[PDB]
Design a protein around this ligand. Structure first.
Ligand code: FPS
Ligand code: FPS
Ligand code: MG
Ligand code: MG
Ligand code: MG
Ligand code: MG
Ligand code: MG
Ligand code: MG
Lengths: 304, 304
């Protein structure tokens, strides 16, 4: 799969080696892995590396919080594949009061106390910005087990649902937290179209690279939790082509969304509407798109 | 607009100039053109040229029938743009029994006697093969004014409907008639998937090149008859990109359908199922695809 040309230069946080060591090391002590094979596969995924490619301009003392959060969410995302929608929903709903800090964790259950301690530490660092990540996380969690996954979707309807299931909004709030980048509600409302476009790119690039893993899961895991819900299958069905052909076509559409991101950013500036915070923010989204792609292309999570 | 590479090479019927003069001449004599500007525009389109690109291996004494049939269907296709769905349906339905030879034309009305005389002449030349074009033409005519054009469609639903509106089956029956190429019902069943894939390519290539013409019609002609119904607009809507971006993505998808055509034909041959008639037929479909594209790239119908 030769990626078509992009004008985006991916960038990686300069503390990625140290933070990956710290965070992988934390999860290897605390998380319950079913065996050695799983522990090695965990390290091979490089979950702190994807984080550092997503947020290459995070503050040095904040990048580790983001790595911890995306790491725990990835581990949960995989666990849900062995569950029904109802089981998965119960699992996620238990973590929500714990994430808010309202209910104490059972210390003999690593997902509970990892989540509790992580969000406590985030609020201890920046309460206001940490709090702004909560509802976006919950929105994503609830999307993950939404029964709409077992209903037929066309490309447009899928992308609208996928914006939640991909965690676009939590990733935006986490990006802002990690950079200490505060935006007003007026600034936030102004970039909604830019956010919705960026979401499509993150989602589809992920779908392209994760298709084989998800196909295998769909054949071996739970009939609900493991269900194949991906633009790759949707376009292959709609257009009657192979999944491989669908990927080639979808990658071209991803470059069209890159072009649209540039035009939308230009138009924001050409109207009177770009602020310094908004420029840092839309540039940050660019890094999410290119970093997501660079990680997806290199991670053993998708290639083995 | 740079077409991506293709391995399909077009061919044009050897008698295209002399047949074009004969057929343009008959319509210029008989058809009620409104004025000299319309007469010039009609010649500029090159309707016999597209027919000769579609069917370059037509028998020399049958190609003119195909040029006449396609030429009258094009003229009607443009007339319907100024009509409501109801008016268009009434207009087409009156021609259906006339096409069958079951109802005599009003000789004061050119479309009726042109349609009647043409089909009588094709039945006189080859009764059985002419009769085989009838229902495919009527299926196409009925699709042209179907209210489903005025309702939302996804990419898959559009391609399914568009197979009828683009005349895929009538073009197949006409190709066979023009070549005297007789296929059994079993042979035809073997290439159903190849026909379906070919329809998508003809449809989408037409959609890409005829977009600017159709956009202009949609804004100036009848709100129903002229309604925009095209993969360019549907993909743009599904993905939230411009029309020009959608055309880029669609062209790549068209090359995927070419690859699929080649794989399906290879499989048919490998399984020992490619009869000499089927080999002629599938090569014929390839000329429709490449011929349609070369004409679409060059006709004044789409560039002015
Ligand atoms: C999209 C991406 C790499 C990263 C964002 C990083 C993370 C953990 C974001 C939180 C939202 C999640 C779990 C997205 C995975 S989409 P998925 O379930 O399709 O991911 P998969 O294909 O299973 O790796
Ligand atoms: C697709 C093609 C060039 C040719 C087949 C030639 C003809 C006349 C086939 C009969 C069925 C029709 C009228 C198709 C035109 S698609 P349309 O209405 O979208 O054609 P337009 O874009 O208006 O030129
Ligand atoms: Mg997943
Ligand atoms: Mg997921
Ligand atoms: Mg995925
Ligand atoms: Mg038309
Ligand atoms: Mg038409
Ligand atoms: Mg057209």
């Amino acid at each position: 799969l030769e990626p078509p040309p992009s004008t985006f230069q991916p960038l990686c946080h300069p503390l990625v080696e140290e933070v990956s060591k710290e965070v992988d090391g934390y999860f290897l002590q605390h998380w319950n892995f079913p065996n050695e094979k799983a522990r090695k596969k965990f390290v091979a995924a490089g979950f702190s590396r994807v984080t550092c490619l997503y947020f290459p301009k995070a503050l040095d003392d904040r990048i580790h919080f983001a790595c911890r959060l995306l790491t725990v969410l990835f581990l949960i995302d995989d666990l849900l594949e062995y569950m029904s929608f109802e089981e998965g929903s119960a699992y996620n709903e238990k973590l929500i009061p714990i994430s808010r800090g309202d209910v104490l964790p059972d210390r003999s259950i690593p997902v509970e106390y990892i989540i509790y301690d992580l969000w406590e530490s985030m609020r201890a660092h920046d309460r206001e910005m940490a709090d702004e990540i909560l509802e976006p996380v919950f929105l994503f969690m609830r999307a993950q087990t939404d029964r709409t996954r077992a209903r037929p979707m066309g490309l447009g309807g899928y992308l609208e649902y996928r914006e939640r299931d991909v965690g676009k909004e939590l990733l935006a709030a986490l990006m802002r937290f990690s950079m200490g980048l505060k935006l007003s509600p007026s600034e936030l409302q102004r970039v909604r179209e830019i956010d919705a476009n960026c979401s499509k790119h993150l989602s589809v690039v992920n779908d392209i690279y994760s298709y084989e893993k998800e196909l295998y899961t769909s054949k071996t895991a739970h009939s609900e939790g493991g269900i194949l819900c991906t633009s790759v299958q949707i376009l292959a069905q709609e257009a009657d082509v192979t999944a491989e052909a669908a990927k080639r076509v979808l990658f071209v559409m991803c470059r069209e969304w890159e072009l649209r991101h540039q035009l939308l950013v230009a138009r924001l500036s050409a109207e009177g509407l770009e602020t310094p915070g908004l420029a840092a923010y839309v540039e940050g989204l660019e890094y999410q798109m290119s970093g997501n792609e660079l990680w997806s292309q290199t991670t053993l999570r998708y290639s083995v």
